[model samples]
Each structure stands twice: as C-alpha cells, then as structure tokens.
Target chain A: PTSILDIRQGPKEPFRDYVDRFYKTLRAEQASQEVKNWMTETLLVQNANPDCKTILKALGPGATSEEMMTACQGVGGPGH
Target chain B: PTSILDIRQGPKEPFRDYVDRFYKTLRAEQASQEVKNWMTETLLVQNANPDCKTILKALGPGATSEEMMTACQGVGGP
Candidate 1:
C-alpha cells in the first residue's frame, strides 16, 4: 500500500498510466468516498501539464474513478 | 517559453529540485508577482505528498519565491 507520501505522477508517464497508478494506490487503501474525491482533486490539480483544470471543473467534486479515467482520455494524448 | 501549460514537478524530483525547476520557468517567463503567487500556491497545493498544507498555511498568499524555497526546505528535507 503506497502512502500518500509516496504518491506522485511520473514525469514521463502518460496521463492514463498516471491515473492507473493513483487509482491503484487508493484502492489498495480502501479509501473512503470523501478521501477518494479528495485524492482525485489533488491528482488532477497536480497534473499541471494536462489541461486537467478543464477536466476537474467539468467533473466536479463527486466525480467517480471511471469518470476521471474517461475525462483524462478525452483531453490527454499518448505523449502527455 | 515554457507555457504555464508545460510546467510540472518531475516525479522522482526532490522538493528542492522541483522548486528549482519551477523557479526557472517562472523566471524565464518573467512572471508578474501576482502570477508568481498564484503559481506558487498551485505548485504547493499540487504537491500532495509533501507536508505542503502546513507550509502553505504558514506562508499565506503573498509569499515570495525565496520564502517558499526556505519553507519547503524547512518542512521538506533531503
């Protein structure tokens, strides 16, 4: 189980891959719904490069993991 | 010009290293003080792994880049 302390998006990691990594950690923790949403917000905001602000604003606080996955796929491409 | 769109902390980067990378981009842009404060808040908030909330709380909205560097160094270590 990766602690929040150890979680981060890899510099060269694609957005989809990074989402997978973040999702895995949260699931491993069996995080609460509130925590899940909080972490989701954090990850999206931290992605500074991905046009994630658009995704976050569109999705809002109650966004599900699947929604985030689809949203990242929508704006993020292979390289970023 | 590293657009605001292009900036991010590298995954394996140390807090100090990330700060340097961020500072460099801001300097290159010659970002205004307002922009610097905004971006600084974003960077600190985005660093979910660090004890950044404490740092941010202590530094507040008008923190300078130097103050941020010092704050990160204080709560964040090698």
Candidate 2:
C-alpha cells in the first residue's frame, strides 16, 4: 500500500491501478452504493483540506464509516 | 493601496520606495513598534496562508484593531 502512493517515481503502477486495487477490496467487502459515493466525494475534499491531520489519522485508524462522512464535510460542497 | 501590492515589472522604483511610502502613513498615525512588528510578522505568514478567506475579509471591511490582532495569531512571539 505504501508503494502505491509513491509520487516521486512518477507512478510505475499509475493512478488507475491504485483505484482498481481499492475497488477490488470494496467489492470483497460488498460496499454499498452510499459507501462508493462517499469515497468518490472524499477524492476531492482531501485535495483541498490537505492539512486536515485528523482526517489523515482516521484514514488508517479506527475511523467508522459515519465518522468518515464528517471528515469529508466539504466534499460536494463549497470551500470552508 | 491597490498600486502597492502589484508583483510585476521588477519594481521600477525600489523596495525602499514601497516601505518608505507605507512608513509615511505609519509614522503619521503614530504607530508603535509593537504595531510595526505585528505588520512585519504578517509579511511572512500571509505568504503561506494566502487562501485564508476569513483573514482577508478582516483586512478590509469591519476589521477592528483587536480583530486584526486575532487574525494575526501566529505573529512575533513565534
């Protein structure tokens, strides 16, 4: 997983490969449509709030799906 | 005021010209060294947090001297 987000080497695996890899996990877990949409929304929000350390911590720790929703508060909405 | 912040043309006059210009106003208002240092510290932080909308809003309309102090929370002491 650490190897996937390595931006320095200019992506030997490419962005699509990473997305596909995560999608397989999503499928394995039988993620609902809501969960998929939430991930899609997070894609943009994290870019803007790149300094939100709380959200970054939750990305790996015991962040529940409900907590993840609030972490991505500005997603699909105006900048805060 | 609008003329001062322009970042182009290699400063046909000089940097001292800009500082002197603002300083005339500063001295005319009898601004203290603390106020001067606050403005000086702002010079750097604003370079980083350029997108802070709330700070920008306070810079213009309805900005109190106290509010300006809060807007510059990361100043001199650091």
Candidate 3:
C-alpha cells in the first residue's frame, strides 16, 4: 500500500493529473472507509491552491473522497 | 525529527503561519544543507496558491528554499 504521504504533488505536476493519480492510489489501499475519506481530504486540500479553499470547505465534512476530488478539480480546472 | 510529510498545512491553517512554522520545523532536522533547502522548497510550493506560480518559477532552479519561500510569501500575500 502506498503511504498517503507519497501522493504529494510536485511543483511541475498538473493538479488534475495529480488528483487523478491520487484517487487511483488510494483505491489500492486496504483501509476503513473512515481512513480512506480522511486520507482523501488530507491529500486534496494539501495539494490544492488557495483559490479552491472556499469551495473545498463548502463541500463539508462528510464529503466522500469522490466529492472532495470533484470540488478540487472544479476549482483546480486551470489544471497546472 | 519531523518528517517532511508532517509539515503539510491544513484547511484551517493560514499559509503565512504554516510557512513560518514549516521553516522553523525544517531547521530542526539533522540533514545536509542540500536536503534542508530541498525540503523547505517542497513544503512551500506544495502549500502555496496559484497566484504565486509565475513568481515561483521565475525564482529559478538555483533559488534556495529561502528565496522560494520569500517569493511564495510575496505573491501569496494579498
């Protein structure tokens, strides 16, 4: 299982591509739903820019990894 | 020593405060000058906004983490 920490995006990586890969990586991990969702939100916010801060927060606490990723990609649409 | 991974900023943390603490945190690590500088830049960019993207790049690869961070805080400021 890849450590959630391994999913940090690099300076040159596109936010869209990074999010896509991050989701894929998490799916391969064997964890509880709680851990997975927590890990997803952690990675999403840590990797995103300030512009998406509001929308990401608006997604609320119960948001699934999928929902968080959607909000991230939406505000992250410029993509790089 | 805090893992570089542990230096990530949260949804509620101000970027300024986070970068400040991040720098403080990295300074505690026992590593080469190279590793320290690298870790600093990594945390700064990973946690910054899109607004600073251009200034960040313009800082050039030779830019130390100190330079990167200064650029980060500069454009990152409103």
Docking quality level of the chain pair in candidate 3: incorrect
Provide the TM-score, chain A, model 1: 0.55
Please give, for residues B1-78, the per-residue lDDT of candidate 2 as tens digits. Answer: 222122221223233333345445444432335434434344322322333333545476445545554554523222
Off by over 4 Å in 1: A10-12, A30-33, A77-80, B1-78
Candidate 3 per-residue lDDT, tens place, A1-80, comes to: 35445666654444567767777876765444544665666656665556554556777665765665666664434444
Model 3 steric clash pairs: none
Q: Per-residue CA lDDT of candidate 3, range B2-35, in tens?
A: 5444665555444566677777876765444554
lDDT of 1 by residue, B1-78 (tens): 464435555444445676676667766644345535554567554653446545656777787667766776654445
Query: Which digits, one per residue and each the tens of the lDDT, describe model 1 over residues A1-80?
Result: 35442455544455577666666766665434543555567654565344665566777765775776677665545664
User: What CAPRI-style quality would you assign to candidate 2?
Assistant: incorrect
* Pick by lDDT: 2 or 3, better one: 3
| TM-score of chain A, all candidates | 0.55, 0.34, 0.56
TM-score of candidate 1 relative to the true fold: 0.38
Error of 3 at A34 (Å): 2.1
**Model 2 spans > 4 angstroms off:** A1-80, B1-10, B30-32, B44-78
lDDT of 1 at B33: 57
